[PDB]
Amino acid sequence: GEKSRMLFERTKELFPGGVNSPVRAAVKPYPFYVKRGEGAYLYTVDGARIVDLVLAYGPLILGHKHPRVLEAVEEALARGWLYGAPGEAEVLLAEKILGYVKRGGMIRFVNSGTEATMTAIRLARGYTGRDLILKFDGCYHGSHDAVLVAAGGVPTSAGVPEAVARLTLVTPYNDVEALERVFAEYGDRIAGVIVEPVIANAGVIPPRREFLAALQRLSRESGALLILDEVVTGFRLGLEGAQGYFNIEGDIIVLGKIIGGGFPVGAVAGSREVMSLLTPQGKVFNAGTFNAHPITMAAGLATLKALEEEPVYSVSREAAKALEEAASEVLDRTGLPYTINRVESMMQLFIGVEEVSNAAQARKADKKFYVKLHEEMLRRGVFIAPSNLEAVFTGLPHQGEALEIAVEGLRSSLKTVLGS
Amino acid sequence: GEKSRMLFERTKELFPGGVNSPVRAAVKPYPFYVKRGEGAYLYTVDGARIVDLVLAYGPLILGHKHPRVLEAVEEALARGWLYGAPGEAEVLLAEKILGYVKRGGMIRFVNSGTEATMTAIRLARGYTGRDLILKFDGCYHGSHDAVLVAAGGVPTSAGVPEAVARLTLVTPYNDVEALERVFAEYGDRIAGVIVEPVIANAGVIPPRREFLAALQRLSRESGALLILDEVVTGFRLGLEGAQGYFNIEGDIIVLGKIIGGGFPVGAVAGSREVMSLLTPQGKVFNAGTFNAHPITMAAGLATLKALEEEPVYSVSREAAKALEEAASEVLDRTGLPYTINRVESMMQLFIGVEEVSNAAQARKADKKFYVKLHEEMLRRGVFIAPSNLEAVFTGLPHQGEALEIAVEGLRSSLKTVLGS
Numbered sequence: 001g002e003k004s005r006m007l008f009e010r011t012k013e014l015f016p017g018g019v020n021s022p023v024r025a026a027v028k029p030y031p032f033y034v035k036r037g038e039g040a041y042l043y044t045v046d047g048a049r050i051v052d053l054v055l056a057y058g059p060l061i062l063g064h065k066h067p068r069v070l071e072a073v074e075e076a077l078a079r080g081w082l083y084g085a086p087g088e089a090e091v092l093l094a095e096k097i098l099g100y101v102k103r104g105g106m107i108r109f110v111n112s113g114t115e116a117t118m119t120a121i122r123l124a125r126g127y128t129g130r131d132l133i134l135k136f137d138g139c140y141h142g143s144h145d146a147v148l149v150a151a152g153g154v155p156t157s158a159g160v161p162e163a164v165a166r167l168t169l170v171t172p173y174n175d176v177e178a179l180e181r182v183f184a185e186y187g188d189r190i191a192g193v194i195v196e197p198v199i200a201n202a203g204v205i206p207p208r209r210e211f212l213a214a215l216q217r218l219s220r221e222s223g224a225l226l227i228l229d230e231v232v233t234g235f236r237l238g239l240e241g242a243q244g245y246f247n248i249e250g251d252i253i254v255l256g257k258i259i260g261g262g263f264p265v266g267a268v269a270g271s272r273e274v275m276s277l278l279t280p281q282g283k284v285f286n287a288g289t290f291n292a293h294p295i296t297m298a299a300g301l302a303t304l305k306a307l308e309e310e311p312v313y314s315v316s317r318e319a320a321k322a323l324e325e326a327a328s329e330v331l332d333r334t335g336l337p338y339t340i341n342r343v344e345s346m347m348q349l350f351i352g353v354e355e356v357s358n359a360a361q362a363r364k365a366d367k368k369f370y371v372k373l374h375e376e377m378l379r380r381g382v383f384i385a386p387s388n389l390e391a392v393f394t395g396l397p398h399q400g401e402a403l404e405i406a407v408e409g410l411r412s413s414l415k416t417v418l419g420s
Numbered sequence: 421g422e423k424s425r426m427l428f429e430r431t432k433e434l435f436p437g438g439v440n441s442p443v444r445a446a447v448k449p450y451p452f453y454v455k456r457g458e459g460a461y462l463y464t465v466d467g468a469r470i471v472d473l474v475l476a477y478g479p480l481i482l483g484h485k486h487p488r489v490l491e492a493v494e495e496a497l498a499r500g501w502l503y504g505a506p507g508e509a510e511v512l513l514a515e516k517i518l519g520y521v522k523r524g525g526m527i528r529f530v531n532s533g534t535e536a537t538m539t540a541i542r543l544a545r546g547y548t549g550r551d552l553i554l555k556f557d558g559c560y561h562g563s564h565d566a567v568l569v570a571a572g573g574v575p576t577s578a579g580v581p582e583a584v585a586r587l588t589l590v591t592p593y594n595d596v597e598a599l600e601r602v603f604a605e606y607g608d609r610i611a612g613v614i615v616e617p618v619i620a621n622a623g624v625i626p627p628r629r630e631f632l633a634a635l636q637r638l639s640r641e642s643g644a645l646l647i648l649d650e651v652v653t654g655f656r657l658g659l660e661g662a663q664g665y666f667n668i669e670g671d672i673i674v675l676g677k678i679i680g681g682g683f684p685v686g687a688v689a690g691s692r693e694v695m696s697l698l699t700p701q702g703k704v705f706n707a708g709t710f711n712a713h714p715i716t717m718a719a720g721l722a723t724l725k726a727l728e729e730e731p732v733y734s735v736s737r738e739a740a741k742a743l744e745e746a747a748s749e750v751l752d753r754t755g756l757p758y759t760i761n762r763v764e765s766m767m768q769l770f771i772g773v774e775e776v777s778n779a780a781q782a783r784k785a786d787k788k789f790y791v792k793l794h795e796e797m798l799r800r801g802v803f804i805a806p807s808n809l810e811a812v813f814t815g816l817p818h819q820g821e822a823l824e825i826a827v828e829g830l831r832s833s834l835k836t837v838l839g840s
């Protein structure tokens with residue numbers, strides 16, 4: 001790992017914490033640098049092939065450099081990559097996305113999930129004329145002030161004015177009693193309730209039907225808009241995302257990751273009535289030099305076509321199931337308390353706890369055990385998130401030999417850590 | 421324009437205002453759709469070649485599909501386009517950028533100018549422990565709450581809480597007296613003063629030396645960080661940007677557009693002391709799935725190399741000068757009040773006013789005349805921003821025949837509008 005070591009030294013003084021995104025710094029023993037990626041694999045700068053169970057944290061459900069997407073991007077590149085004026089790809093991608101998540105509605109393309117949720121929140125506030133936003137402990141919506149808050153709302157980040165943080169309410173995920181209580185107290189001032197249909201940033205945590213039911217009922221009865229943050233679930237839990245998977249409906253649907261095919265993206269979709277408030281039609285401001293970036297649009301379009309024509313969902317589901325069954329077989333024999341949460345192709349293991357239905361329980365999981373597992377798996381050529389609070393993602397290339405390596409790696413790594 | 425007309429009809433119900441960014445909707449008679457771009461030209465979906473004096477509003481100083489950048493991106497695409505782990509290109513681009521704008525400092529790559537200024541503001545607040553941010557009337561820093569404010573600070577966008585807007589102070593650009601007064605009253609609570617060294621979103625407005633002097637003095641004496649928003653000026657006003665061009669120094673330098681070579685990008689650069697507050701090193705949060713996107717990094721790196729090895733600055737400067745001289749020759753003969761502001765390769769014409777040193781004066785310019793000019797120029801195959809408040813940008817391909825067409829087009833269009 002000499003080459004990665006050298007790069008590690010160079011970035012120490014170039015980037016805060018040596019990385020451009022926090023999670024990247026936690027890789028053990030130290031972050032490896034990537035030369036390239038193809039299919040189910042990442043290849044380090046030193047030349048090592050690694051099975052990728054991170055998939056850039058969600059966007060790469062088709063694996064690395066998917067042939068169909070590569071070809072579409074090559075064609076798009078030949079046409080120039082930025083215009084500052086409308087292109088064709090954005091129209092086709094919008095029509096395809098809306099047909100699955102909000103028929104007859106509108107969409108606005110942005111450049112990150114952070115920009116997307118931020119825009120959704122401004123839209124909900126503009127539509128209702130209210131200021132408060134309700135989020136849940138453990139849910140992650142990006143790097144912007146309004147969502148960098150925790151229940152005393154107080155800042156979880158330095159540099160966030162307390163005056164801003166106090167406009168965001170926070171209650172526990174899957175806690176119906178707490179949800180009812182917050183609406184009883186502040187309901188008429190809540191502009192929107194934002195939530196991940198399946199938590200992906202506090203490990204993976206599935207929603208309780210009762211929580212989903214309350215979210216829809218309380219939002220509708222209070223006048224608050226239900227903002228489903230589907231940046232991760234969108235197009236991962238089937239073509240119709242969380243709405244179709246759980247049979248729920250959101251007022252505003254925030255999308256990202258997968259819809260950009262691996263390129264910078266974010267999007268806000270909703271009814272014509274709500275979406276029409278966005279500039280230049282309405283007074284809720286949103287603009288972006290890179291909005292509807294030609295390459296992002298071409299990549300996302302090709303990606304969704306693959307999701308419609310290739311067995312991505314079945315393959316990804318089976319891959320996650322195989323990993324879950326393998327880990328469960330080993331862990332069940334130990335008699336140690338543990339739980340694995342899986343929803344289709346997103347999952348995570350929690351050692352030390354028998355149930356994880358909220359962030360508080362996820363935080364009680366054995367972090368040391370997880371870190372050791374991450375390191376041992378990497379030593380065996382399999383890459384899983386370095387943080388127990390991140391998720392494990394599967395995709396199209398996780399089949400055949402690649403899957404065999406991942407499963408065998410997981411089995412052996414668990415045994416090694418359990419034997420230490 | 422049948423094909424653009426058809427697309428126009430399709431997007432009416434897909435996007436708010438029919439576009440993904442406000443300015444795009446103002447093109448006359450209606451927005452044309454782009455098939456591709458190459459060199460100094462955009463090509464409509466109907467097949468018409470148009471000289472581009474918009475350059476995607478700043479990023480394309482090298483023109484469309486620059487050969488060197490295209491090759492670098494092709495090589496990068498073959499390596500996969502998203503890893504979720506550190507790559508080599510981000511290291512090289514960071515080293516090159518910092519060598520020109522903040523030697524010995526640090527940088528953090530994000531996905532838009534909006535994310536960049538938003539991150540800079542959070543950093544300034546975190547570093548100083550203060551809440552107030554001072555901006556100037558007419559300056560544009562992106563699509564986020566803290567900068568969508570105007571002096572009563574009150575919201576300029578619906579959906580922005582008044583509690584948030586009041587944390588942002590606003591005074592006129594180039595107004596030293598007003599600047600001194602605001603610091604005398606609120607100085608000890610100002611975390612940072614953000615400003616465009618050259619305004620590019622209220623037409624083009626150059627800074628007064630006295631204003632630049634006051635900005636540096638007052639920030640230093642008050643403890644507020646001077647945030648130079650160089651999203652547009654960075655790498656356009658020479659390799660050293662505004663700091664080198666005007667011989668000024670900022671505490672935090674916000675970069676974007678050009679540094680991404682045409683791909684989604686944004687960046688915050690500053691001293692190690694300030695930048696070290698960013699996660700995972702410090703407590704000022706910033707994370708991004710697409711931060712340091714492999715393709716953006718490769719494109720930006722190749723772009724900066726071109727700026728160092730090709731006569732981009734001289735060619736672009738001469739192009740803008742030729743346009744300015746041509747327009748001035750025609751307008752001087754009319755005796756009508758007007759002014760053209762130009763700083764290297766960024767400029768704008770203001771009809772009806774003899775001086776434009778601030779946003780208030782820019783707003784007094786004859787908008788109807790400008791719109792007619794935009795439409796007439798487009799009819800003659802030359803594309804300038806549809807809004808008088810946007811800027812005209814020149815670049816490397818604006819030479820030879822392309823420049824002749826632009827200049828002749830400007831001359832003829834002015835005469836036609838002046839004769840109507």
Ligand SMILES: Cc1ncc(COP(=O)(O)O)c(CN)c1O
Nearest residue numbers: 112113114140141142231708709
């Ligand atoms: C649900 C959710 N929302 C928002 C984001 C942030 O997306 P981005 O990093 O592109 O700003 C993420 C990524 N962790 C996410 O998982």
Ligand SMILES: Cc1ncc(COP(=O)(O)O)c(CN)c1O
Nearest residue numbers: 288289532533534560561562651
């Ligand atoms: C000075 C400045 N700052 C910020 C921005 C916004 O950049 P972006 O559109 O990528 O969010 C712009 C683009 N108009 C700008 O000119």
